[PDB]
Amino acid sequence: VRMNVLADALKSINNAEKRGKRQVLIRPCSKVIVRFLTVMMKHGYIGEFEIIDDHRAGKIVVNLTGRLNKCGVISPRFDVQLKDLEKWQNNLLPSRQFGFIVLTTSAGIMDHEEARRKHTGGKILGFFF
Amino acid sequence: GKCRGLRTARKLRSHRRDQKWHDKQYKKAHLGTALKANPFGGASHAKGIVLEKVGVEAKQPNSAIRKCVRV
Amino acid sequence: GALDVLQMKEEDVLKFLAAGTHLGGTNLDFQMEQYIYKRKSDGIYIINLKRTWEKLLLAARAIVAIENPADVSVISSRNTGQRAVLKFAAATGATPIAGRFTPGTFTNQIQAAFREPRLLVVTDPRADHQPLTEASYVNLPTIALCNTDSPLRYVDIAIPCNNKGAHSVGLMWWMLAREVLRMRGTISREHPWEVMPDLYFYRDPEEIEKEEQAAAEKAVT
Amino acid sequence: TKKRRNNGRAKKGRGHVQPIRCTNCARCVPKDKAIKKFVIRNIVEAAAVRDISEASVFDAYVLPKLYVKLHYCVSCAIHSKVVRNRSREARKDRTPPPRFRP
Amino acid sequence: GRVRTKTVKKAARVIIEKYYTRLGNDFHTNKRVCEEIAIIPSKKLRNKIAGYVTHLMKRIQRGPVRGISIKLQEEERERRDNYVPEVSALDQEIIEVDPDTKEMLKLLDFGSLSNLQVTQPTVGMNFKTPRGPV
Amino acid sequence: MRAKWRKKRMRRLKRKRRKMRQRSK
Amino acid sequence: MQNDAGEFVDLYVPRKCSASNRIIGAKDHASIQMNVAEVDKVTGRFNGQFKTYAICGAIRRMGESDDSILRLAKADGIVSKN
Amino acid sequence: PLAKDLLHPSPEEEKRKHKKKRLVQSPNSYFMDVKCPGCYKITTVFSHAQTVVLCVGCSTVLCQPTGGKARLTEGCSFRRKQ
RNA sequence: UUACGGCGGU
RNA sequence: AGAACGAAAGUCGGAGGUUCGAAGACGAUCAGAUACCGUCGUAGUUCCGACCAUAAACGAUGCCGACUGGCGAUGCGGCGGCGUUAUUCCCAUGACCCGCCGGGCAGCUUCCGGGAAACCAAAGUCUUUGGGUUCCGGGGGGAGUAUGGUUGCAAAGCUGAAAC
Ligand SMILES: [Mg+2]
Ligand SMILES: [Zn+2]
């Protein structure tokens, strides 16, 4: 009864960074949560991470930098269009200078700016700032 | 908690419409027995005839007689 | 102290082992599990002496970096540690508080017991906790010599030696005062320091003068 | 407000403990709420000890004990003063008062 | 009905602090010293201060009371600083350890550098005092 | 008045209005 | 703080905790800034210079200021490296 | 305990955990070779065995099943294979 | 052992 | 939607009937006692069968999942250890001693955090607001009333307003 493995991954990272730690252990791996973490690693909010591969579903250890505020999840994956995308931004971003809602398209798991650079809508997946 | 998943808009909408029957300002406006029962019948004014000059006593903090009628 | 001059110098290990200084309480604290070696068969947690030496040097480097010498306030409340805390500050030039700590020395500016130090070193984290919880609010770093029982709430350079027995307390005050003068230009690292660690130990009760004069029929007369 | 963390009663994983009855008013209490007191009183009333050993058939006879386990309702335990009123932070210890036998 | 108030006590602790060499265990002489060295505004609290002054004369000549006067205080500089022994409490060169704490100094490469004859722990595990009130 | 003894004097009272309605059918 | 015209529009830059990367505020009055003074290599005496480390009040009160400055002094070449 | 390197655990912190919950999960069990006194037959019984183990040559009883870890009946040879 | 009430507004 | 179980009192029938004892009679106590208190005692408390389906039915806290401090223990399994003790004059298994592992009942501490605070390691991970889902609340009365339906032999249960 883990209805969203993406939601449980990000909640664990959010508890451990406000606790002050350096590493986490994300007990189920997924190819949506490694393509969620490399969206926030390339913007520089986390560090190296290591997929501890097993023969069942793997585990992930993430190096936390301490440069993170909250890395929440939007749990019903509401479909967002490009007209709809700006009003999602002022709901769940702190400012217009920083922070990213990250959403999955047909062309990949992206940003809000990466999805409007390429002019494509999709399904909202999470946010981090 | 509430039911959040996308496709539950039948349950969220049918639960909101029968929980609005639990405050005053919806239920006295949308039932009908609160407009059949006021004497103006959904009006701001009505005419009537005078039957009895009556005086009612004011509340305990106050002590006076308020001059009323029996329209 | 990652150097070679600052290494252990085996001679003084014999002073640790002859004073206690590696024998701790049967319960241990969770923030001191890195300093410990193992529990004995008698329940006693014995302590890695290399780890209490590395913190001893690290506490010494903090006090050397304080420019005004009479500005590292040095406190002790329990009786085992009051002779040591005074002639700590006599030798190294610090400022002592002994006996009872009056609450607000640090946080109240009006009264005449108002000191404003930049560093403070503590004999015991729990039995002398009242300056710890106060020195956190004139943003002051704190040093303690802590045994395995003791919490590490506001301490920074917790020395994991011993703070129960009278021998071990005065020795670690002597060992810290020796090495903090030696990182100054006062001991030239070669000859051992002419002050003896017995000078910092806790005082005997009233039979002091009775016993020494029974072996002094050849000094006064 | 919730006055005490337990509700006066030492039941945690139960739904019903046995009802027992108080001693000096015969009121029915739960067994865990009841204020027990186990009296190991000597049956001889110690001022009357040198009047039964000088009138016994021995010189060394161990006197029998009277083992009466009282238990009270909280109503009669406060009235007969076997539990005293306590302040709102000195309630929180489960140690009994010390012995004071001599 | 005897118990002395704050202004009598605080004015007599300041006398014995500051004129201790000029005092003694007589009442009628200490009455006259405090008469001549302190401004007392009447006769009744004069000798009532002098009473508590003589009460502290016998009190501090038996020991160190709250006594910041010089001679009782300089005499404990010959306790904190004096009695440095001629042979140490540390340097006995014959001290005991246990087989696990010598393994602690074995990785410190001090195993044969030291003398350190060992004692063994008496093998019981009888620590952790028994539980419950009796 | 207590609320378990308010419940009694309405349970005693709505068996008395239930019975007069039974009379005047 | 770097506007689009390229200039600093900011009263000050605030310190951040060397243990936990979080900003010490203007009234986080449990936050220390300590000096650890290294020594010269041949003789082991204080040579004038030192190292500054900040510990915020959140991570100090939490109780691991010791494991902090044992881990960023090990980082500095201090301690055993063992 | 903030910067505990939980990707390289020590082998004695890895051993004193559950058979799940580890950095990589692994059984506590093993296969053991049991030689009876007086037979030329190596038997390859599982450690947490569950059955009344009978042999072929000397078909006597060889271990007793219990709660956790199967108990060899009479004093017989034992080695932990692989 | 018994110990029941205290007009309204301020 | 639909069902199964459901303290006590209660209802119907058959056994039983010691104690206790609503109703009731009597003695006290009081201004009055239809109460407390005392003597007595019916129905009932006990068993069998059928019902009734509610309680401060309470941790006044739905269930499932993860994550976030420490500590002392305890209950049950499992593993590993010095030694003490049992037929044991050896053993295997027990009793204790020292640990670890999972599950449970809780406790003690803490600026984890939250809260209107009491307090809570959950009531935390919430304007930095979204893990799944069920039930339900919307000022105080009227009122769990009136009325319709439905269940029950009955008592009543369930659903359940409004004028004011
Ligand atoms: Mg009642
Ligand atoms: Zn009672």
Side-chain angles (χ1 to χ4, degrees), chain D residues 7 10 21 46 51 53 56 62-63 74 84:
Chain D
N7 299 115
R21 299 185 69 89
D51 297 332
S53 178
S56 179
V62 172
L63 292 167
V74 28
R84 192 180 291 172

Side-chain angles (χ1 to χ4, degrees), chain H residues 2-61:
Chain H
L2 298 178
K4 299 290 177 66
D5 189 77
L6 49 91
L7 196 148
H8 298 93
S10 70
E12 287 82 5
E13 196 270 334
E14 181 72 21
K15 185 66 63 64
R16 309 296 283 170
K17 291 177 71 178
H18 196 71
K19 67 178 180 180
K20 306 288 187 176
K21 294 191 176 182
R22 287 175 184 170
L23 203 279
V24 46
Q25 83 191 11
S26 65
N28 293 317
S29 305
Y30 56 94
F31 291 91
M32 59 193 178
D33 282 327
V34 169
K35 170 70 77 175
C36 181
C39 191
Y40 296 105
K41 189 65 68 180
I42 293 294
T43 308
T44 173
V45 59
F46 182 68
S47 68
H48 294 269
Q50 298 181 3
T51 63
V52 178
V53 168
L54 296 177
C55 186
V56 173
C58 291
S59 67
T60 188
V61 72

Side-chain angles (χ1 to χ4, degrees), chain D residues 22 24-25 73 76:
Chain D
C22 176
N24 53 1
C25 66
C73 69
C76 289

Side-chain angles (χ1 to χ4, degrees), chain D residues 29-42:
Chain D
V29 297
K31 188 182 176 182
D32 58 351
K33 185 191 278 289
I35 308 299
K36 302 198 292 180
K37 183 173 77 174
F38 177 61
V39 182
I40 53 170
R41 177 175 290 168
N42 198 359

Side-chain angles (χ1 to χ4, degrees), chain C residues 14-40:
Chain C
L14 271 290
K15 286 196 262 77
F16 283 167
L17 271 64
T21 317
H22 66 281
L23 298 173
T26 182
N27 48 358
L28 85 164
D29 196 4
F30 75 107
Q31 286 168 349
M32 287 183 67
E33 196 267 328
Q34 64 176 354
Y35 302 108
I36 209 67
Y37 184 80
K38 67 168 68 177
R39 176 185 280 179
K40 287 177 66 174

